[PDB]
Amino acid sequence: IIGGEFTTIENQPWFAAIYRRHRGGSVTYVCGGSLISPCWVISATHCFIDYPKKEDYIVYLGRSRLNSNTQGEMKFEVENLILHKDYSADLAHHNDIALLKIRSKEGRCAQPSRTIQTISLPSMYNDPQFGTSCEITGFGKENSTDYLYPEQLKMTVVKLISHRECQQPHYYGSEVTTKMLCAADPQWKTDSCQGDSGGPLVCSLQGRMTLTGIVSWGRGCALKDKPGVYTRVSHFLPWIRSHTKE
Numbered sequence: 001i002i003g004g005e006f007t008t009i010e011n012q013p014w015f016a017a018i019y020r021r022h023r024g025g026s027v028t029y030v031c032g033g034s035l036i037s038p039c040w041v042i043s044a045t046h047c048f049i050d051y052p053k054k055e056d057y058i059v060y061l062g063r064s065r066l067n068s069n070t071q072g073e074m075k076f077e078v079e080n081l082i083l084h085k086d087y088s089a090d091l092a093h094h095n096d097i098a099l100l101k102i103r104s105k106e107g108r109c110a111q112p113s114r115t116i117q118t119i120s121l122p123s124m125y126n127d128p129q130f131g132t133s134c135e136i137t138g139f140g141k142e143n144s145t146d147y148l149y150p151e152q153l154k155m156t157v158v159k160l161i162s163h164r165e166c167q168q169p170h171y172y173g174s175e176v177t178t179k180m181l182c183a184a185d186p187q188w189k190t191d192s193c194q195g196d197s198g199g200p201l202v203c204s205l206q207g208r209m210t211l212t213g214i215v216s217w218g219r220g221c222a223l224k225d226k227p228g229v230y231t232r233v234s235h236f237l238p239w240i241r242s243h244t245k246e
């Protein structure tokens, strides 16, 4: 997250931190995700496509720090890693959505607590109007030029951009489809960045906090006329519903 503010997991208790174990034993951060039911985390396919083997991954819930344990956190293995079969990449990632079925070493799913909660899905084809303020959360870079990721979780606020505006040549042209959502700051001063992929774009939809988007792609970070692009969750409900019975 470029700009914005530090936070803790109590302010985004559905946030999942996803790591990969290497041969040799070293563990590195992959991407964010969101707990949508006790056994299911939703994220982005592009985070996993190069290493599609479920055994490679570790998921934490209730974690506020990147490389230290948070009191109360839960650690899970990935029982199933489900990637979208229509995924494609050209800048733009199409159908950039993934499901992780989580399972602890003891065979259990997430147990809700002060630091671990689920986020509601939107109803179909129901999104906030352009100009609406939403929140994004992640452990991604704080500056495009940084090498390190922040040790503490961050969040910021971005505003939804209409498809009409995002499709202008001077924005992203045809790279953006109707299954994607653009969001940015009016001054371009805050944005998602490398390492934020897979995490939640959350909007309040009729009084309910709702998973409107999943961090997917963008040209650079916090650049004029280059918004963050998000998988439009409300266009994938049948896919999510079918695959969460797996």
Ligand SMILES: Nc1nc2ccccc2s1
Residues within 6 Å of the ligand: 191, 192, 193, 194, 195, 196, 197, 215, 216, 217, 218, 219, 220, 221, 222, 226, 227, 228, 229
């Ligand atoms: N504005 C955005 N920059 C990035 C970088 C990596 C992934 C997602 C995004 S969205």
